[PDB]
Design a protein around this nucleic acid. Structure first.
Lengths: 95, 95, 95, 98, 93, 89
DNA sequence: TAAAGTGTGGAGTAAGTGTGGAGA
DNA sequence: TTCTCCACACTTACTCCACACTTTA
DNA sequence: TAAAGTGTGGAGTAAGTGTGGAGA
DNA sequence: TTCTCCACACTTACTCCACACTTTA
């Protein structure tokens, strides 16, 4: 499963940058693997929470998981991914 | 589009299908199955199911909604779904 | 001309010709695009009414008045309410 | 995707495009997105300021503030060569193209 | 430190930068193209010149230029890498 | 690529391989790359801290967690030298 | 055996229907 | 006026809880 | 000419980011 | 512990309103 220099091997559970392997947490893996299906879609915090976490936690906690993932992407020279869409949620890539 | 192992949920029509047939689900029952199919293997607590799929009523009332859904699944030949995880809550499917 | 199961655009006619109000015409013409979709009251209000600031219950009354007109031409079980969500033009089959 | 006369709104991405023969993406604010997405349902309908406020702002603010949101949206439409949209209907409110 | 109209190429680091100051993820071929053409921005380079200078049938040349162009457009830089029909390409009019 | 007795480190990809498998190392854990230069040398906790970790038990814990990842596959590799530090051997 | 979960069944009440009527 | 909207009571059926049976450590 | 609408600009404030740290 | 979540301050940019100009009957 591939999108613009980000490869996810689902079996078993590795995410590569074009190949550098990332050290992702389980939550972080779920986020990137969920959003890469529809890269340009805006996912709400509620959707990311239900699909990638665990509560039942705060919506701000979603933001922090996305931040931590983003930092890991930037340290492999991938910037302008995980863009926030103010008041709605997040998007993997904008057209 | 939501699909998982012979259970299809069309979110636009509010329909849930079994492959082999449309189920007559209540709104609460629809929310439960649509919530849990996001993370099939995850154990959801009664508190999570209550806040997402139902008042701050009793936790036992969650059990009854899950039971009624389970029965409807079993009458379409689906038995190994909605497993209770003792003292925590419920899981859609074991890994 | 939009056709769906015994219910038949430039003329503003719905067919045997029905005497529909403008609101009523908009409702039936809006919902026939996606017959089996559940439309919320908010969607019907924004698309088919004046006073988007009106009550959601007023949507129900427009649908009722349309339904009555459909039933007097021998069309029953059509504008089905989906409790807590909204309305649907027709239920899907269990096939 | 909501379409009306050279204005496309993709609701999943939250994107609004202008179409000759390429799609230009607009940089709308959330309020601005709600306005255009609300009014495109009934293009020819006159929406009052009260309707736009309740549906697109989320405030108890002044009605003149609605005008400013519509203005800012209009300017963004005009810079993509779209002039005949967002017509004011004096004393009532606003309408998408006549 | 080659500069031209909002495009900076640092030749020592092999970095190209584009509202400060976004680094582009260019391939080696792509780097050579942009670094070659920025010397004479307005010059029309032939496909033969770009091939000999930047690429170590014709659709492949065009494809390298396309992929570079897309990377420029995602940083809000459009109407760069203009094709001159039957000859080749130009960085800017 | 840095090689030593069935442990390969590719420095360009930041990957560490076991011969027989890619390891899922943290950045701190990757910084195995320091000790493989002088496999038999005893590195102090102070040296490992300054070079790899951008009280004393915390250094030990990083080394332990690396060791466990080696053992899940390679045993007897990150030998502790009591009170002083660690050796790859 | 306690501890916890399942499942049928019914009372209350949430939610929707539709007649009627006031305002433009 | 008609049509749109709202009001008021009618009407429907789902949600919740009860009580007993069954399963699990 | 009144009346109403447009549009630039600025003050306050939502909303998002990311470091840091407590709990399992 | 690590990871998950939450808190706090930093930072960004959108909303709202003001004030004057412009447009319409």
């Amino acid at each position: 499963k591939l999108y613009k220099n980000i490869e996810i091997d689902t079996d078993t559970h590795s995410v590569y940058i074009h190949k550098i392997l990332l050290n992702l947490t389980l939550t972080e893996y779920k986020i990137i693997s969920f959003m890469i299906d529809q890269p340009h879609k805006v996912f709400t915090r509620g959707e990311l929470m239900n699909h990638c976490m665990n509560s039942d936690a705060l919506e701000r906690t979603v933001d922090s998981h996305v931040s931590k993932l983003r930092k890991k992407l930037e340290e492999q020279g991938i910037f302008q991914m995980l863009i926030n869409v103010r008041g709605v949620g997040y998007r993997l890539d904008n057209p």
